[PDB]
RNA sequence: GUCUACGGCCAUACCACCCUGAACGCGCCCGAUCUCGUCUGAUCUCGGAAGCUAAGCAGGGUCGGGCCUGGUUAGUACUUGGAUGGGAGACCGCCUGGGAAUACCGGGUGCUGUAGGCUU
RNA sequence: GGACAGAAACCUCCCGUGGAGCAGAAGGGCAAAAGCUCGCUUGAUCUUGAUUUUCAGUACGAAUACAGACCGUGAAAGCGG
RNA sequence: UUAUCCGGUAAAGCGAAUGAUUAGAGGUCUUGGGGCCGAAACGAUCUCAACCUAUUCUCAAACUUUAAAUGGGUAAGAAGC
């Protein structure tokens, strides 16, 4: 026949990966080079601007490494955008910019530097770096963490990066992976980046669908219709969302409702129960065998 | 032209078996370790005796085979052709080195392999014989005769186990009646209660 | 004209005759071999 | 009733031609299935050198292509129509995939060209179920699952019930 | 004579333990090391950069210099006649904190606390670690049953 | 009670199969115009929200394999020091102290850090 | 499993803890890498010190942490004399 | 002595990795060898061989899951809190 590869000795010699590696969530090779501060810094925190894109929202946080795990200082999500004006379309490039801007301004509010480090009040789409000013406390600087995202040109991870940079965070970067950097001539024009920041590509697609096939337009965009969001006012709405975010970036926690203490999963079986089950099974098997014989 | 056993009678050196670093070793003289009707069930051959050494010595492969032949000859003569089972529980692996002169002298003194020798510890069993209960005197005489083929001191002991098994003879039939042991030829299979119950229900089926 | 090659028989007795003394620890160990940038910072601090 | 997410759909239909040599014959064979599939195929380079076949390492000896979507369905349909919608159960693998081979590409519906000649193809179908993408997704790769696999019996039942084919024993 | 290789005879010393191969834990990289801290040396074969020499494996030293990835330490190496307090540079993953100093630190903090306390109360307490004294007199209560009688068992050849 | 994002310790967490998943979340899933990449929108990137727990993922189960930790093995094997001890030797016994590993037989099957949710 | 296809040519699916590969002899080490394929480049560069390795605690060779400029790569954290 | 770190020898193990090594068992068409009914047929039948599954006997200075005794560093304060 065939030799059983996963035999009793296979598990004896088997070495498991880390829990995150087995689950595939994290990349420890990049984490080592991302979270490890120099030893001569003597416990100076190193901040990573973590960006994650899910199927329905975008998570933007900043964290520093510790022996008991990372500490989340400021967390910004995309499901809270409807509080600011973006009612629908929370997983696009424009939403990535908005949540990155929200994370930056909220962090500045937490550290009490809202008025200082204004940053890009209005969008431009070109390269920009927050330059620290003398006398005033120095600017907050962190480093981008894309995780496992395949960082090509025009990624929503970089969109969140641009939003945070415009928010006032001095994150090192370059205008190479931003949408608009063409590779045939190796140059960057801010106009295309501005269109992607404001979601003009989505509006153009919306116009294209409603012009060539209305039924497919309904099939693709339906929540936009339900929220009566037309392409013409798309950029104006995002500008309003940017103004609202930069106005009131604070976060308030929802009140903790008191539970009724109801368990939703079957509790673990105990030793007595499992030792009784085999006794019942053996007794049933023999009593069935004798009466069937 | 083989040297007397008195030369290689002491476990003088650390074990030096035939391996990737030792090539050209001549094949061991003894290659058959089981004799008689080795295709015998554990039920029909309860009695078991053992030839066990009483010193930390070295037994050559040729000595092992000579004792095996002598024991086999007596068993087939007394108990019958198909009425016993002789198992040699020592395999010669420690190869021995021979330095031969032809006037080089002691320069480059490292012997080439000459033969294979089995190293025996205190109380380790050298030979085992399994047969019926009434054939006890014949086995004792057979091993006593084979003692003369070995150097050092060896003794004959009749183990309390059931044949070539690690279970006591008195409780062996009781356990197999309780269906804790399954005969599978010259040995037995021990059935614990730690497996899935499908095996248990199949056995009790 | 052969002779033995290496020996370490009486060496331990030779060592312990004068004693295997540990190095005499002394307060304010020297600052050689430290990071030059850190050393420059310290010297500037002592200067000012 | 049944959960719609367990529907058996074709994930990939791969067509390859192994001419066993490089050069004009390789290009000529490549043009055949290129004209068939409407897309550029890819050459495969040999791994080892054996003198029995006269093939050496890194030698482009076969041309293969993969087709998805509706065009894969049409190619499979015209491939089966020359096999008369019949297959042997040996063609079905243990993993729910199957395949067959055609001796000449002319019978599919292409027009013969004396400069082109005739060439055979191997049509291999790998069936699939919604959710097989987690077996190769980059972010969180996971095992497909015991109940979500496609059995050999399940695959042949799908074949004989969807295309109304027959699986004679053998 | 033997070869003078740097890693000669380190087949098992630098080898990773059983079922602990692969990616190194990040806790070692995250721990901080001040100068003057007592530290231990244990070479690890996963990272070959800044490998401490085999003569220092298992030794305990004091940190006197810290860099971005490695720390400079001073260790006592025994040479033929004397002991040399020589300084080496070792990458951080080959080094770990030692609890030998921590035990003294906890004890000195405890006795300082118990010296500040009860000082104004007038009582005097023991502070020096007295060695384990001989067991004091005590009563053994044979509660009923007679003590078991033990005798050597007869010899039998189990083999 | 529990989930998501980032983790620490790296199987008590793995592996095979089976059962249950309120809500939220994670996904499965629908398309290629744009960003982007392929032989193929399969993967990747992007734009999404019709349907679905079927799968992953969560919890539970297997007189489960494994893994962790106990008893047995056993004061056995081995061993610091000692003897004008035995034995021709091989080696063995004793005094003073330390003290293993199999097989075999039991128990258990992730703890927790920061932030944000569901259980209004 | 799939035409010629055969034991071995090529294509597809599943299992697959390193049973492969890393230039050589061997050992150690390595699985989204240290390995296989690409893209871009010369940190195989210029300079002063400190330390480890046989050690006499002297050299050469080799090696390790840093420091000052010029850089390469990557979106970046970082990595590379 | 009290705490705290390092080892891979002694011992032990192959139902655990690697290299050896013995003999019984049960499987199947996974193949071959000695046949047989057959145009043939995995249609069927004894085997004998290799293969798989649990086992069993004996080994390693250049093997090892475990793992000592002896031993090797550090600390046991006012150069400290
Ligand atoms: Mg990366
Ligand atoms: Mg010798
Ligand atoms: Mg798709
Ligand atoms: Mg599910
Ligand atoms: Mg178990
Ligand atoms: Mg938690
Ligand atoms: Mg890589
Ligand atoms: Mg430099
Ligand atoms: Mg050694
Ligand atoms: Mg040994």
CA distances from A158 to A105, A135, A193, A228, A240 (A): 17, 31, 11, 29, 22
Dist CA E75 CA E87 (whole Å): 6
Q: Output the distance from B41 CA to H49 C1' rounded to whole Å.
A: 24
Which residues have CB under 8 Å from D103's CB, separation 6+?
D120
CA A62 to chain centre: 11
CA distances from D137 to A27, A51, C35 (A): 15, 19, 47
Dist CA A266 CA D117 (whole Å): 68
Dist CA A262 CA A50 (whole Å): 35
Dist CA A238 CA A229 (whole Å): 11
* Structure tokens that stand for A175 in this block: 């205008």
Paired sense of beta strands D60-67 and D42-45, if any:
antiparallel
Dist CA D17 CA D32 (whole Å): 9
CA distances from A283 to A56, A278, A287, B62, D75 (A): 53, 8, 6, 59, 60
Who among A24, A149, A150 is closest to D141 (CB)?
Answer: A24
What is the maximal distance between C-alpha atoms in chain E? Answer: 72
For chain A, say whether B200 makes contact (Cβ under 8 Å): yes
For the beta carbon of residue C24, count every other beta carbon within 10 angstroms: 6
Which residues have CB under 8 Å from A29's CB, separation 6+?
E23
Dist CA D118 CA A287 (whole Å): 71
Q: Output the distance from A190 CA to F25 C1' rounded to whole Å.
A: 36
For chain A, say whether B194 makes contact (Cβ under 8 Å): no
Chains touching B (3+ CB pairs < 8 Å)? A, E
Number of residues assigned to chain D: 170
Dist CA E33 CA E28 (whole Å): 11
Dist CA E60 CA D104 (whole Å): 78
* Structure tokens that stand for B8 in this block: 């290689």
* Structure tokens that stand for B51 in this block: 């030839």
* Structure tokens that stand for A173 in this block: 């970067």
Dist CA E60 CA D74 (whole Å): 74
For the beta carbon of residue A13, count every other beta carbon within 10 angstroms: 8
Number of residues assigned to chain B: 205
For the beta carbon of residue A140, count every other beta carbon within 10 angstroms: 23
How was this structure determined? It was done by: cryo-EM
Dist CA C28 CA E64 (whole Å): 12
- The secondary structure of E80-121, three-state, reads CCCEEEEEEEEEHHHEEECHHHHHHHHHHHHHHHHHHCCCCC
Asked if A33 CB < 7 A from strand F, the reply is no
* Structure tokens that stand for E56 in this block: 């220092």
* Structure tokens that stand for B114 in this block: 């000459």
Beta bridge partners of A126: none
Counting Cα atoms < 13 Å in the Cβ hemisphere of D74 gives 7
Dist CA A163 CA A59 (whole Å): 13
The DSSP secondary-structure symbol of A198 reads T
Dist CA D119 CA D107 (whole Å): 11
CA distances from E41 to A44, E5, E150, E155 (A): 25, 20, 51, 52
Q: Do B and D make contact, counting contact as 3+ CB pairs within 8 angstroms?
A: no
Beta bridge partners of E96: E40
Cβ pair D158, D42 in contact under 8 A? no
Cβ pair B135, B36 in contact under 8 A? no
Tokens 């080898």 correspond to E15
Asked if D131 CB < 7 A from strand F, the reply is yes
Of the residues A38, A40, A65, A68, the best mutation for testing chain E's interface (the one with the most E CB atoms within 10 Å of its CB) is A40
Answer yes or no: do E26 and A17 touch at CB < 8 A. no
Which of these, A27, A142, D161, lies nearest to E26 by C-alpha position? A27
Instruction: Using an 8 Å CB-CB cutoff, list chain E residues near A39.
Output: 32-33, 66-71, 92
Burial of residue E66 (number of CB atoms within 10 Å: 0-12, 13-18, 19+): buried
Answer yes or no: do C20 and E83 touch at CB < 8 A. yes
Q: Which nucleotide is nearest to A31 (CA to C1')?
A: G77
For chain C, say whether E65 makes contact (Cβ under 8 Å): yes
Tokens 């369905």 correspond to D73
CA distances from E29 to A47, A240, A293, B168 (A): 16, 45, 69, 58
Tokens 């368990």 correspond to A263
* Structure tokens that stand for A285 in this block: 């098997």
* Structure tokens that stand for B106 in this block: 């002691």
H or E element in which residue A220 lies: helix A214-220
F strand bases under 7 Å from protein CB: 1-2, 4-11, 13-23, 25-31, 33-37, 39-68, 89-92, 104-120
Dist CA D26 CA D22 (whole Å): 5
DSSP secondary structure letters along C4-47: -----SSHHHHHHHH--PPP---SS---TTS-HHHHHHHHHHHH
Helix axes of A93-110 and A156-167: crossing angle, nearest 10 degrees: 40
Q: To one decimal place, what's the resolution in Å?
A: 3.1
Phi, psi angle pair for A196, to nearest 5°: -70, -35
* Structure tokens that stand for D167 in this block: 């699986």
- The secondary structure of chain B, three-state, reads CCCCCCCCCCCCCCCCECECCECCCCCCCCCCCECCCCCCCCCCCCEEEEEEECCCCEEEHHHHHHHHHHHHHHHHHHCCCCCCEEEECCCCCEEEEECCCCCCCCCCCCCEEEEEEEECCCCCEEEEEEECCCCHHHHHHHHHHHHCCCCCCEEEEECCECCCCCCEHHHHHHHHHCCCEEECCCCEEECCCCCCHHHHHHHHC
* Structure tokens that stand for E46 in this block: 């996963």
* Structure tokens that stand for D60 in this block: 């482009």
Which residues have CB under 8 Å from B109's CB, separation 6+?
B99
Answer yes or no: do A35 and E26 touch at CB < 8 A. yes
Cβ pair A27, A151 in contact under 8 A? no
Asked if D100 CB < 7 A from strand G, the reply is yes
- Buried b / exposed e over A253-271, threshold 16 CB at 10 Å, is eeeeeeeeeeeeeeeeeee
The DSSP secondary-structure symbol of D55 reads B
Dist CA B8 CA A5 (whole Å): 45
Which residues have CB under 8 Å from E75's CB, separation 6+?
E41, E56, E59, E60, E61, E85, E86, E87, E88
Instruction: Using an 8 Å CB-CB cutoff, list chain A residues near D138.
Output: 148, 150
CA distances from A264 to A260, A268, A269, D160 (A): 12, 12, 15, 44
Q: Which long-range contacts (CB under 8 A, 24 or more apart) does A112-119 make?
A: A113/A137, A113/A140, A113/A168, A114/A249, A117/A168, A118/A168, A119/A165, A119/A166, A119/A167, A119/A168
Paired sense of beta strands E70-78 and D121-128, if any:
unpaired
Phi, psi angle pair for A142, to nearest 5°: -140, 175
């Amino acid at each position: 026949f065939v030799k059983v590869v996963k035999n009793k000795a296979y598990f004896k010699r088997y070495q498991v990966k880390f829990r995150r590696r087995r689950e595939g969530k994290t990349d420890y090779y990049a984490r080592k080079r991302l979270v490890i501060q120099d030893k001569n810094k003597y416990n100076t925190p190193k901040y990573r601007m973590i960006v994650r894109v899910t199927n329905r929202d975008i998570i933007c946080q900043i964290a520093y490494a510790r022996i008991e795990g990372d500490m989340i200082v400021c967390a910004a999500y995309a499901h809270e955008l409807p509080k600011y004006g973006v009612k629908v379309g929370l997983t696009n490039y424009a939403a990535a910019y908005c949540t990155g801007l929200l994370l930056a301004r909220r962090l500045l509010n937490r550290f009490g530097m809202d008025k200082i480090y204004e940053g890009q009040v209005e969008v431009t789409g070109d390269e920009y770096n927050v330059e620290s000013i003398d006398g005033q406390p120095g600017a907050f600087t962190c480093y981008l963490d894309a995780g496992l995202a395949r960082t090509t040109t025009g990624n929503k991870v970089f969109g969140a990066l641009k939003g945070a940079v415009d928010g006032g965070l001095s994150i090192p970067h370059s205008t190479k992976r931003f949408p608009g950097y063409d590779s045939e001539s190796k140059e960057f024009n801010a106009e295309v980046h501005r269109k992607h920041i404001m979601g003009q590509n989505v509006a153009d697609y919306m116009r294209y669908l409603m012009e060539e096939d209305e039924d497919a337009y309904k099939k693709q965009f339906s929540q936009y219709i339900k929220n009566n969001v037309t392409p013409d006012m798309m950029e104006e709405m995002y500008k309003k969302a940017h103004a609202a975010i930069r106005e009131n970036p604070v976060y308030e926690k929802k009140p903790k409702r008191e539970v009724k203490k109801k368990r939703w999963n079957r509790p673990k079986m105990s030793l007595a129960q499992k030792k009784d089950r085999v006794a019942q099974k053996k007794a049933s098997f023999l009593r069935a065998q004798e009466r069937a014989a | 032209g083989r040297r007397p056993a008195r030369c290689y009678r002491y476990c003088k050196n650390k074990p030096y078996p035939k391996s990737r670093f030792c090539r050209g070793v001549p094949d061991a003289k003894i290659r058959i370790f089981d004799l008689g009707r080795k295709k015998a069930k554990v039920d029909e051959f309860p009695l078991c005796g053992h030839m066990v050494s009483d010193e930390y010595e070295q037994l050559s492969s040729e000595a092992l085979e000579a004792a095996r032949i002598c024991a086999n000859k007596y068993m087939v003569k007394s108990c019958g052709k198909d009425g016993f089972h002789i198992r040699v529980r020592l395999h010669p692996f420690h190869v021995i080195r021979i330095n031969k002169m032809l006037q080089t002298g002691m320069r480059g003194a490292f012997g080439k392999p000459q033969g294979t020798v089995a190293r025996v510890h205190i109380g380790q069993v050298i030979m085992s014989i399994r047969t019926k209960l009434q054939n006890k005197e014949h086995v004792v005489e057979a091993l006593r005769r084979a003692k003369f083929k070995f150097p050092g001191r060896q003794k004959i002991h009749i183990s309390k186990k059931w044949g070539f098994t690690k279970f006591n003879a008195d409780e062996f039939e009781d356990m197999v009646a309780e269906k804790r042991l399954i005969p599978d030829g010259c040995g037995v299979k021990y059935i614990p209660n730690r497996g899935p119950l499908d095996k248990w229900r199949a056995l009790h089926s | 004209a052969k002779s033995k090659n290496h020996t370490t028989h009486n060496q331990s007795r030779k060592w312990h005759r004068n004693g295997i003394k540990k190095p005499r620890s002394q307060r304010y160990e020297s600052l050689k071999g430290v990071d030059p940038k850190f050393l420059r910072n310290m010297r500037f601090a002592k200067k000012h | 009733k049944e959960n719609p997410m367990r529907e058996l759909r074709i994930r990939k239909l791969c067509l390859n031609i192994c001419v066993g040599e490089s050069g004009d014959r390789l290009t000529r064979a490549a043009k055949v299935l290129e004209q068939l599939t409407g897309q550029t195929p890819v050459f495969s380079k040999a791994r080892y050198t054996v003198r029995s076949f006269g093939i050496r390492r890194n030698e482009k000896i076969a041309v293969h292509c993969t087709v998805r979507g509706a065009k894969a369905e049409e190619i499979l349909e015209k491939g089966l129509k020359v096999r008369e919608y019949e297959l042997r159960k040996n063609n079905f693998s243990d993993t729910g995939n199957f395949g067959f081979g055609i001796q000449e590409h002319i019978d599919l519906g292409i027009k013969y060209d004396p400069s082109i000649g005739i060439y055979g193809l191997d049509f291999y179908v790998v069936l699939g179920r919604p959710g097989f993408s987690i077996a190769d997704k980059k972010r969180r790769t996971g095992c497909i699952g015991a109940k979500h696999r496609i059995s050999k019996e399940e695959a042949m039942r799908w074949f004989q019930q969807k295309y109304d084919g027959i699986i004679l024993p053998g | 004579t033997n070869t003078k290789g740097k890693r000669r005879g380190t087949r098992y010393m630098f080898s990773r333990p059983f079922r602990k191969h692969g990616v190194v834990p990040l806790a070692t990289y995250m721990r901080i090391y001040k100068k003057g801290d007592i530290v231990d040396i244990k070479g690890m074969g996963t990272v070959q950069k800044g490998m401490p020499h085999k003569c220092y494996h298992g030794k305990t030293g004091r940190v006197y210099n810290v860099t971005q990835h490695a720390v400079g330490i001073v260790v006592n190496k025994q040479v033929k006649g004397k002991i040399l307090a020589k300084r080496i540079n070792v990458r951080i993953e080959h080094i770990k904190h030692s609890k030998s100093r921590d035990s003294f630190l906890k004890r000195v903090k405890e006795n300082d606390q118990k010296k500040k306390e009860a000082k104004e109360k007038g009582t005097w307490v023991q502070l020096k670690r007295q060695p384990a004294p001989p067991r004091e007199a005590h009563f053994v209560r044979t509660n009923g049953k007679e003590p078991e009688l033990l005798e050597p068992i007869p010899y039998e050849f189990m083999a």
